[PDB]
Design a binder for these strands. Structure first.
Length: 33
RNA sequence: ACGAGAACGCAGCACCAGCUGUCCAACCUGAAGAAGA
């Protein structure tokens, strides 16, 4: 129950600069066997 | 003062010998420790 609007992104910061990284972003690669 | 008197149907003998209550069978199936703004 919040009087808010549509959902927003959930970034983070990491060194120094504020390097915005998408939370939970993973690169998925596959191979046989 | 009896077709009667006396006379254990009794003695010894293991209901006993051999034989698996065993064979086959997944405690298994699905599920983001996760999301406001």
């Amino acid at each position: 129950r919040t009087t808010y609007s549509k959902m927003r992104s959930v970034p983070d910061n990491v060194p120094t600069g504020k390097h915005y990284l998408e939370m939970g972003k993973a690169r998925i690669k596959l191979e046989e066997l």
